[PDB]
């Protein structure tokens, strides 16, 4: 016959019973974990349920090792993930405890509507039972009551979202399994054999769309009968209903006109993002490809452009949308439905103290010498350059931003510029700093220009609205923007950088655009002298192509010259050639700290806001007066990159604040200002040899 049947080794009643047992029994190495979660959900303090597969595997192994039988729930969820969502939902709806907190005037409207619906359900059931008993015509009575009565289905009474997260490599390796769901893949490797599975992808996010409401079930009302009609929607488009379909109106002769009611309708928060391959994944001589990710529920706003992540999701098909004339059979398009997100580098804003992080931070503090230990760990493969490394670390930490009132604003971010002879490894330091920062961006001259910086006007595919896509300067907001070949740029880019360093904004007034952007970012630039090597026979301002003011606006301006010396060349050559023989640095009495711990400590330090006392203020004013007196005579001799100005004092203050923050203190001390002045002085020793 048409539509024959087939046999599979899959029984769903067994899996439902196993799901119930796991949901009511699991113990974390206090009552059941998920029962406590469900109680918190019932009391209206939780919106999302996360199901960890490690718990399922542990439950299975616990059942096995003591003899009894058990089914492989993990693999069933992995290979057919889209079906188990509703199984888990139905199991959970059968065990949710009653709310121990009353509903008051400070709850969400959704909760009020759900509670009203449940009360209405109970009232209808009781009315039906009373009428049936009064008829005079108890399992049978409840069964007949269930048969003749409508209700609100479970999906219209839920208030939570359910997600899965994959099997970690550690658990599978300890239990001797192969965690397929958490083996990262590139978009290239994901073929049609993986459809319907729960898989993980590694990539970098390139685009994200604004959150909008996606309708799941529409609601209508009939004034004729008083029923509520619900219309499921799972397509990109739908046809609204016209006339009532309830039993009363269906059975009568005069039907009522349905009216749409947005408040009873079921909506979802929807986003769509694009993910692109990493360079190391692309084959030789090819161009990277992309992929589509769908995000729904409470997982929205968890992805921003420029993030390198590992997304988890169920790989599902979609209808074909190409040209009609090129369709050969039942072709489909693919997308990923997101279930879990992890980042390769944690943001500072999301910081939080806890036992695990606190122990590591305390160990680092106890080890002593935090300043130099952090400074020497930046690009350890580069010999020497300790002072520039201290300045770079301070740029990583930053100062304190001050709100003066009346709308005024003082920056707290520190800008640094490196300028030296060829072959001094400026680019290596630029790239290493860009890699350490959580929101770092790297640019080189002519490659990025015009709208590559700033932003441009384009149209969203998902939504039908116009938007602005940020460039290099907007992508590194609240981060570090690294610029190579600083002296070879065009005037417009120089003006944009000028404004960004000035006041952390970019103003654009062109055809179709009149707006102001936010550019709260730090600048790290590199440049070369105008004639290749530095010429000590010329004025400092004649060796560089940049305007003097632009140089003046840098807190630290480093000069790095290459004077041959038979001694230091030996050490540099030894370091480099050792680094090439092995893969590590040669020093053995010092151990470098890995990037994650540095990021953790900087995140902890960034929460401080040290204040300035009076004696330190006296010291600062005296130092400023002395330095300003000294600088004028030097600049009159045409031997200064620039005369000292109040920006120098502001830079000293910012550097002192940064050092105080590094020390994890609420007050500033004299030694911090001493170190700041020491750095600002040593910045120019190359010019006095």
């Amino acid at each position: 016959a048409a539509l024959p049947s087939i046999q599979l080794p899959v029984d769903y009643n067994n899996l439902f019973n196993e799901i119930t047992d796991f949901l009511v029994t699991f113990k974390q190495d206090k009552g059941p974990k998920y029962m406590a979660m469900l109680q918190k959900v019932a009391n209206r303090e939780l919106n999302s349920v996360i199901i960890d597969l490690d718990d399922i595997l542990q439950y299975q192994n616990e059942k096995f090792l003591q003899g009894t039988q058990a089914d492989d729930l993990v693999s069933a969820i992995q290979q057919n993930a889209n079906h188990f969502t509703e199984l888990f939902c139905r199991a959970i709806d059968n065990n949710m405890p009653l709310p121990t907190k009353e509903i008051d005037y400070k709850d969400d409207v959704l909760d009020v509507i759900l509670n009203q619906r449940r009360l209405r359900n109970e009232r209808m059931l009781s009315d039906r039972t009373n009428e049936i008993r009064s008829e005079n015509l108890n399992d049978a009575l409840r069964e007949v009551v269930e048969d003749e009565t409508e209700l609100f289905p479970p999906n219209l009474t839920r208030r939570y979202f359910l997600y899965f997260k994959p099997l970690s490599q550690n658990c599978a390796r300890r239990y001797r399994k192969k965690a397929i769901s958490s083996k990262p893949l590139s978009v290239r490797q994901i073929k049609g054999d993986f459809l319907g599975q729960l898989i993980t992808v590694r990539g970098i996010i390139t685009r994200v769309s604004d959150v909008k409401p996606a309708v799941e079930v529409i609601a209508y009302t009939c004034d004729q009968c008083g029923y509520e009609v619900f219309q499921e929607v799972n397509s990109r488009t739908f046809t609204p209903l016209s006339e009532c379909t309830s039993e009363e109106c269906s059975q009568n002769q005069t039907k009522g006109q349905l009216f749409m009611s947005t408040r009873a309708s079921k909506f979802s928060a929807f986003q769509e993002c694009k993910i692109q391959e990493l360079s190391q994944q692309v084959p030789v001589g090819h161009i990277p490809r992309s992929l589509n990710i769908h995000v729904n529920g409470t997982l929205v706003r968890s992805l921003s452009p420029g993030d390198i992540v590992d997304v988890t999701g169920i790989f599902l098909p979609a209808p074909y949308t190409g040209f009609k004339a090129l369709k050969a059979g039942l072709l489909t398009e693919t997308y990923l439905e997101a279930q879990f997100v992890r980042q390769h580098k944690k943001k500072f804003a999301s910081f939080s103290l806890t036992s695990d992080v606190e122990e590591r931070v305390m160990e680092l503090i106890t080890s002593g010498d935090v300043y130099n230990r952090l400074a020497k760990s930046i690009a350890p493969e580069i010999y020497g350059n300790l002072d520039v490394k201290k300045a770079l670390l301070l740029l990583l930490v930053g100062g304190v931003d001050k709100r003066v009132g009346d709308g005024m604003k003082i920056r707290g971010d520190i800008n640094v510029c490196l300028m030296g002879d060829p072959g001094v490894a400026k680019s290596q330091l630029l790239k290493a700093i860009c890699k350490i920062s959580p929101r770092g961006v790297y640019t080189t001259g002519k490659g990025s220009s015009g709208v590559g910086l700033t932003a441009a006007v384009m149209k969203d595919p998902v939504t039908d609205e116009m938007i602005l896509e940020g460039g290099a300067l907007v992508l590194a907001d609240n981060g570090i923007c690294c610029i190579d070949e600083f002296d070879k740029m065009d005037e417009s880019d120089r003006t944009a950088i000028h404004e960004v360093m000035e006041q952390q904004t970019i103003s654009i007034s062109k055809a179709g655009i009149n707006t102001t952007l936010n550019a709260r970012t730090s600048i790290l630039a590199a440049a070369n002298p105008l004639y290749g090597r530095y010429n000590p026979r010329l004025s400092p301002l004649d060796n560089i192509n940049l305007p003097a003011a632009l140089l003046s606006r840098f807190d630290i301006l480093f000069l790095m010259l290459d004077i041959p010396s038979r001694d230091d060349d030996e050490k540099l050559a030894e370091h480099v050639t050792y680094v090439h023989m092995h893969n590590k640095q040669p020093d053995l009495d010092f151990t470098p700290v890995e990037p994650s711990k540095m990021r953790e400590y900087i995140a902890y330090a960034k929460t401080k806001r040290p204040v300035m006392s009076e004696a330190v203020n006296d010291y600062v004013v005296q130092a400023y007066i002395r330095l300003r007196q000294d600088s004028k005579r030097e600049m009159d001799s045409k031997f200064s990159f620039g005369q000292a100005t109040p920006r120098t004092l502001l830079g000293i203050i910012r550097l002192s604040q940064a050092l105080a923050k590094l020390r994890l203190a609420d007050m500033v001390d004299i030694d911090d200002v001493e170190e700041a002045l020491r750095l600002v002085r040593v910045s120019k020793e190359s010019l006095y040899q």
Binding site: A1, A2, L3, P4, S5, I6, L8, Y12, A81, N82, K191, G192, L195, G196, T206, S279, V282, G285, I287, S290, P317, A328, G329, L330, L331, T332, E333, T334, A379, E381, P422, G423, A425, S427, Q428, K431, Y442, T443, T444, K446, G447, S448, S449, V451, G452, L453, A456, M458, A472, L475, K488, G532, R566, A573, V576, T577, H580, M581, N583, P595
Partner: protein
């Protein structure tokens, strides 16, 4: 129902497989590999039309002229043999001589329809690889049963069939609802490509011709746009050319295309497809033997461009660039270069372009550029385009295509600053960064460079220092590993000798050189030794602290150049470590180039 002709043809092809016993063991080997390694190999083999020609001329002509009647029998016979040997159906591929059936898109006409052809050309545009639904699986909640359906279309079989357009089932035979099981359904990959006439064969000034090719399953992503390709398949027509119904319009005809079964990439000059040669045991023995001699470097050097007189050190440098060093990746994410670059400044009749063209002809992957020939987006791939799906994409440039290869530039001094800044990043960081409206990416550009330049005054002058004669930025020269200066001074004996040499021409072979280079670059990766460490350290110190006037500056790039040259020489030696001799050779070459 069964057909007698089909069975007779199946029996004949089984006899063919019986007489020749290479394909049987090929199938056995594929099955053995797939069993042992569980990666899974596709079930396919390749047959030679020549052997079929000696065996049965009638069957040969049938496959050539009537593939729709003779090939399915052969595939069934092969599948039967495969199923009989072992403790998906199998497919076939064709090679050998196609005779008059080897054509190009221009010379493919309506008289070749329904026959097996082999076409050559250039890939112009591919398509997105999509899945195709073949079998769906469902579930009924009220009964606990699983159902399924099969789907087919006109391009999955060579012979015409009566359509059976089955619908997608949402209900049961009794009215119950159904649930889709995406994990238990089946999907197959699908792609469509376009092939055009080669730029080096099409007539000049004339618009080109092209043909579409459809691929399925295991031949889905075997080429990229811009490749030279050879596709063997069946030239077939489909549908009705406006015949069904009235369809008053008569302009359109029958839709036609090729149902491909074999795709072969071809290597050419100045293209992105690299040359590879299969290495036999005789070749390996001879190479490993020649590795043991002491003048092996000299022999390999004198073989390069033997029609040119002298320039021995430049030949050595070109060999070193061909072999190359080793690149290093640290755990933190740092990268250390391993390529070698060469520059040549010389007089206007010194055979610079001859050596450049030799390198273009002998390197497995090389692209030829000239000073003002390519500029702007033509070098870094900085051009953007977009699909008809809406998205914007990039397309490779000269240096992006030549990743892991070499690039030849002629008239180097004729470039500008806009492209010199661009090539700085390529020559040191070996990456290309693009930031345009709607694109932010980074492309790998790990390639080596060899270039030739002219002196400022037309001829090299010894009365002035090199800075006035080269006139190129110092930062740019620092990125070139070796710089050579060649001058022609009139000398009676030298002129005589070069005269008899040029007259001789006008009245180790390269393939063995290519095999040698391929094996050396693939197999051996040496390590640094303390002896070479001391030698290189001493030489770098001496060079950095000497008063001699050089042709190029001295930095840490020179130390890294010394290491790279030593490692490349060791690579030539086939040794797994660097000795003192390799370091000394590197130092000697660097000193000769500098002084």
């Amino acid at each position: 129902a069964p057909d007698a002709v089909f069975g007779d043809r199946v029996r004949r092809f089984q006899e063919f497989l019986d007489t020749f016993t290479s394909y049987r063991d090929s199938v056995r080997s594929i099955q053995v590999y797939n069993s042992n390694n569980a990666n899974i190999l596709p079930h396919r083999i390749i047959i030679s039309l020549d052997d079929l020609r000696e065996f049965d001329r009638s069957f040969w002509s049938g496959i050539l002229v009537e593939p729709a009647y003779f090939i399915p029998p052969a595939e069934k016979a092969l599948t039967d043999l495969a199923d009989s040997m072992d403790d998906h159906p199998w497919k076939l591929s064709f090679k050998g001589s196609f005779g008059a059936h080897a054509l190009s898109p221009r010379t493919l006409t309506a008289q070749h329809l329904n026959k097996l052809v082999s076409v050559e050309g250039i890939v112009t545009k591919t398509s997105l690889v999509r899945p195709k639904l073949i079998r769906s699986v469902h579930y009924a909640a009220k009964t606990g049963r699983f159902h399924y359906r099969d789907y087919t279309d006109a391009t999955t079989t060579l012979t015409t069939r009566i359509p059976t357009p089955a619908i997608y089932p949402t209900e049961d035979t009794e009215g119950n609802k159904l649930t889709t099981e995406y994990g238990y359904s089946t999907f197959i990959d699908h792609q469509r490509i376009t092939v055009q006439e080669m730029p080096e064969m099409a007539p000049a000034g004339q618009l080109p011709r092209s043909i579409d090719v459809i691929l399925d399953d295991d031949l889905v992503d075997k080429t990229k746009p811009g490749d030279r390709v050879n596709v063997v398949g069946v030239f077939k027509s489909l549908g009705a050319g406006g015949m069904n119904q009235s369809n008053s319009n008569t302009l359109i005809g029958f839709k036609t295309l090729i149902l491909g079964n074999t795709v072969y990439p071809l290597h050419a000059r100045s293209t992105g497809v690299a040359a590879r040669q299969m290495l036999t045991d005789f070749d390996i023995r001879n190479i490993n033997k020649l590795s043991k001699k002491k003048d092996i470097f000299d022999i390999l050097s004198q073989s390069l461009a033997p029609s040119i007189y002298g320039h021995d050190h430049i030949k050595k440098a070109i060999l070193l660039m061909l072999m190359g060093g080793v690149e290093k990746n640290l755990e933190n994410g740092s990268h250390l270069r391993g390529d070698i670059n060469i520059l040549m400044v010389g007089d206007p009749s010194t055979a610079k372009s001859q050596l450049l063209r030799f390198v273009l002809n002998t390197a497995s992957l090389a692209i030829a550029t000239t000073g003002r020939g390519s500029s702007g987006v033509g070098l870094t791939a900085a051009v953007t385009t977009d699909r008809e799906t809406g998205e914007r994409r990039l397309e490779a440039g000269a240096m992006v295509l030549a990743d892991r290869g070499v690039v030849c530039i002629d008239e180097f001094d004729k470039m500008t600053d806009v492209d010199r800044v661009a090539i700085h990043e390529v020559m040191e960081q070996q990456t290309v960064t693009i930031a345009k409206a709607g694109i932010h990416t980074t492309l790998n550009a790990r390639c080596s460079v060899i270039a030739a330049a002219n002196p400022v005054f037309g001829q090299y002058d010894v009365n002035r220092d090199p800075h006035q004669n080269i006139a190129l930025p110092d930062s740019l020269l620092s990125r070139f590993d070796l710089l050579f200066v060649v001058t022609d001074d009139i000398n009676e004996i030298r002129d005589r000798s070069i005269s008899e040499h040029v007259l001789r021409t006008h009245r180790v072979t390269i393939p063995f050189l290519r095999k040698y280079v391929q094996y050396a670059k693939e197999r051996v990766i040496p390590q640094l030794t303390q002896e070479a460490i001391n030698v290189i350290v001493k030489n770098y110190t001496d060079l950095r602290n000497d008063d001699n006037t050089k042709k190029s500056p001295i930095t840490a790039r020179t130390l890294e150049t010394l290491i790279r040259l030593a490692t490349a020489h060791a690579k030539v030696r086939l040794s797994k470590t660097v000795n003192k001799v390799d370091a000394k050779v590197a130092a000697n070459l660097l000193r000769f180039a500098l002084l």
